[PDB]
């Protein structure tokens, strides 16, 4: 499927709100946000490439996990 968890740095809220306003901005995607462990579960019909452009927007610690 188009399931696709990235690994991010947020060891302040805020930037999973900016990773938000990012990704929002995109608009079909959905997107689970863990803090503690910092990461973002996004699933999406917008693949992955497409994900990635835009989420390295925020410009955090951002690296891509597995497909599912
Ligand atoms: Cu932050």
């Known amino acids: 499927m188009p399931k ?3 690994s991010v740095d947020m060891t302040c809220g805020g930037c999973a709100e900016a990773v938000s306003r990012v990704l929002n901005k995109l608009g079909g ?3 689970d946000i863990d803090l503690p462990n910092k ?3 996004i699933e999406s019909e ?3 490439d497409t994900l990635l452009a835009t989420l390295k927007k925020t410009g955090k610690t951002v690296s891509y996990l597995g497909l599912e």
């Open 4 to 6: 696709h968890e990235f």
């Open 46 to 48: 917008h693949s992955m």
């Open 39 to 41: 990461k973002v579960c």
């Open 29 to 31: 995607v959905k997107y």
